[PDB]
Amino acid sequence: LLPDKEKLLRNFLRCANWEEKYLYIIELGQRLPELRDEDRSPQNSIQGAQSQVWIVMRQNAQGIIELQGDSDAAIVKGLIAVVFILYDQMTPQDIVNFDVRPWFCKMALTQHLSQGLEAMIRAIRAKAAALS
Amino acid sequence: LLPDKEKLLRNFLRCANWEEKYLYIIELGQRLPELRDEDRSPQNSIQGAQSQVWIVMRQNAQGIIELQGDSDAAIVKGLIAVVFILYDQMTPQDIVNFDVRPWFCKMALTQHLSQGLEAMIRAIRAKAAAL
Amino acid sequence: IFSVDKVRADFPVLSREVNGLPLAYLDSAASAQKPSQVIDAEAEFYRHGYAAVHRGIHTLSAQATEKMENVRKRASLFINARSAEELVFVRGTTEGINLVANSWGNSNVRAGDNIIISQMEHHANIVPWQMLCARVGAELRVIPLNPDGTLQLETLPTLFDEKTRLLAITHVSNVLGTENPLAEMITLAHQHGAKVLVDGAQAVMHHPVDVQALDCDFYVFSGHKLYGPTGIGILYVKEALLQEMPPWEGGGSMIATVSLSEGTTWTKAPWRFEAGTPNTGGIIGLGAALEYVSALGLNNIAEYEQNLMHYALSQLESVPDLTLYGPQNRLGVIAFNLGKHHAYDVGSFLDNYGIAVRTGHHCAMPLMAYYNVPAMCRASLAMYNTHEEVDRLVTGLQRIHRLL
Amino acid sequence: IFSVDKVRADFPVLSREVNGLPLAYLDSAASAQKPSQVIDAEAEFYRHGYAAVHRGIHTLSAQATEKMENVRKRASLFINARSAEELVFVRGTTEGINLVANSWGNSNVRAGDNIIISQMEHHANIVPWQMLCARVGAELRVIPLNPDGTLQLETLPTLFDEKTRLLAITHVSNVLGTENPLAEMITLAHQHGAKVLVDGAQAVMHHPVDVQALDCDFYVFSGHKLYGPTGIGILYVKEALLQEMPPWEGGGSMIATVSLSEGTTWTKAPWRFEAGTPNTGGIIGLGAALEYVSALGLNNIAEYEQNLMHYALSQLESVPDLTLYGPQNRLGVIAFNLGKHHAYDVGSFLDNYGIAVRTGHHCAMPLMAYYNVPAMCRASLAMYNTHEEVDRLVTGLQRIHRLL
């Protein structure tokens, strides 16, 4: 399973350098649940990520958002994992109002790497807003 | 009337500064006889000098060429007159084979002004060659 | 307050000597001089951080893309646009107007419609609409001018009908310096169903412009007229319209997939109208110039320029047989003619005195034909011009009047 | 002979630290670094002699127009065109191809015809022709690829026909580095009454080019890849074919007259396709860049580049599971993948080693498709790239393979 945003940030800042951080992103991607061959369709495509990125969001029996995804680029999939960790167990309104900037600030992902990440965040916020 | 190319270049080089040269050019233009309102038509209009320019060329009772010109701009008319002087009293072939370049160089016009005069000379040479 | 001494300290061309004399550049309307800041911005981006700007992988490319998008954001804040995704980078006002006319036009104007322009309009705000009318088969109606260089607005009821599609009007006229009532004309246009495009290539460098206060649907301007470099310019489009306009130029970046058997699809807004490699250095310099002008405060610039214009119009009364064109409340430019003397001669002389003014039709020939003249002499009163240059121009005009 | 030390000396960017480590810019095929000479030519033009260029009456304007036209002559003499009036300034290869397709396409292509492209073309040389075939209802035909990244010339018979209007081919591929046989393709296309457009954007910077020895009808290239500023590009056209093509963009300067009652008449060649203000600074910089390259000598540059390429190909044989794309006789670029790992991950790790290589589809999706891959990494070996950067790439790939 994937760690919560707290454990994620702690384990990431625990990384001594940057290669460890990039492989940790790669792994976090490698932990995601596989995507159904039906869901990997042009209806679940994300542009601007410089790689084929699929992301599906849906409300379960309640008003909770359940996310899944995939990317043919390892580090992009790890970014999918991290974004899912940040937005985990939240309704569309929580997603729209939640400011994710400080978490990235605390993990330094635009100074190392980040525009495909912006595409992912924008698409997720668009789905959440369309739902709310 | 207009002086010959010799007197023209002489009196031009005799100018003390560029203001006198430009005013002498404006005056030379002023000396050009008036153009017939019929000749002031598109068939005789020239292009590329940034101002309306008409130049009619026609062979007189002999193989000699007679030029009439006008331009809504003073200095343009003066350059018309300078050309008429440089091409004065010559047959079509004599105009085709006359090298105006050293005259303008000794007058240093491209360094104090440049393309409209080139276009006028090209039009006159095209007429002379067609004849 | 404003201090033209400090300001001129930054433009290096203002130290040139034109024809043995110190240069007095009075053609900023044709193109403004660039401060050292903008030159250095562009050259430094070139020296210590140039790379491709298509979301590249390596650090330099991603930084360059960030820089370009930051410049777009600055420009969107300049005109006060809702979203930075409502501004497209172009070559200039000419290419922007062409883009709007082809993209939005070819899909929004058909036979039987009609487009409205003004008789004072620049060629850049005239020719594209003529091409469009010739392609689709629409009419082009012209807002007439009054003798004083203002629009005959009373004719608006007879030019706007249920088939008026677009009003392509000029903000500040590059010949008369007249400022049209943008908000009121735009309200009248929106009351009929016809969009509005505004050529502000001349208005931006003088006072603040607020694309949301005018409610204009399209706004255009060029970068070389805002003290920035050439080859770059801004076209603002309302997000509602911009998100529905098809693509103009086709190539890389603006696409999303490119197939030889399943067609091609296009990318989202702004970028869909930016084919090939953008002018990255030009955008850097344009952002630098934007920052410069904002640091100087457009209101102080406008105050200084209005005071200088009043001083110059007072000084040009002591020039006999001078004829001015435009309203008293003109901005930035003075168009005139010295007696019956042709503009070409007045200008050639003035330049021989080191004074640089523009002479001819100024890409506004319908204005000339209205005024019954063949050309005019325009002088530009930019933020870096001094009272002493106004005195030099009055001196040159008087000496020319004598010698001719 | 050549000397890469003195050459790198002139590139300030080549002293920049990426991610904490000395940079090794191997992405020149997407964009080339500029020598301080070009930066400085542009800066000096902005500092000591800028002014609008529309044959202005004042000294600065006329000097600037002469500078732009002298740069136009330098361009025409670089590729070796008959006349300096056989070249047009555009924003880049993309805009040039769009212009060729819109001005010359709409009038020379009718329904039923067919255009011939190649499966390795850049998007800039794919999208314009697709849009054109949509506007006129023509058929786009493609020359396939062989496994080695060379064109299947054998398939030219079944492609050319009496309806074949144009062959749009690339001189050198930005992805495989392949150099197509332009002379023979052009002879075969002329035998069929078909014009030839050559996208040589990747060819001008590696060896001499001669538009008469090729006899091509149109030629295109961009300056940001020629070690020169952005937003400037050269479109060469045959004088005969050029003087007849209709004008594309409408605006000022490119009109002989502009009447709202008698229609608009155009101006002569090149300048007919230069609407509004042209990028004077970009053009000055492009002149400077052409001068610099001509000084270095394309022959010495090609020698050094082939030497560096053979060395890089010898050293890459020690990288396990490295798949390369293209023939052995490539120019400037190596396109690869590291085992099964995605291109983005290899490029990302390389970047964090200071190695700037590009990753993705390189604006050539049909190529990716032909190679059953979703993306490649591309590393370019420019005239300023050393052997140390080759060794660094090899070592970085080895480490990336061991770690992944």
Automatic annotation (TrEMBL), chain B:
Q: Annotated pathway, please?
A: Cofactor biosynthesis; iron-sulfur cluster biosynthesis
Q: Which residues form the active site?
A: 49 (cysteine persulfide intermediate)
Keywords attached to this entry: Cytoplasm
Give the primary localization class. Answer: cytoplasm
Superkingdom of origin organism:
Bacteria
**InterPro entries (alphabetical):** Cysteine_desulfuration_SufE, Fe-S_metab-assoc_dom
Q: Which GO terms describe its biological process?
A: iron-sulfur cluster assembly; sulfur compound metabolic process
Q: Which Pfam families match?
A: SufE (PF02657)
Instruction: List where in the cell it is found.
Output: Cytoplasm
Q: Which GO terms describe its cellular component?
A: cytoplasm
Q: Which residues form the Fe-S metabolism associated domain?
A: 10-126
Q: Where is the signal peptide?
A: none
The record's family statement is: Belongs to the SufE family.
Q: How does it assemble?
A: Homodimer. Interacts with SufS.
What function does the entry list? Answer: Participates in cysteine desulfuration mediated by SufS. Cysteine desulfuration mobilizes sulfur from L-cysteine to yield L-alanine and constitutes an essential step in sulfur metabolism for biosynthesis of a variety of sulfur-containing biomolecules. Functions as a sulfur acceptor for SufS, by mediating the direct transfer of the sulfur atom from the S-sulfanylcysteine of SufS, an intermediate product of cysteine desulfuration process.
- Which named protein is this? Cysteine desulfuration protein SufE
Origin species, per record, is: Escherichia coli
**What lineage is this protein's organism placed in?**
Bacteria, Pseudomonadati, Pseudomonadota, Gammaproteobacteria, Enterobacterales
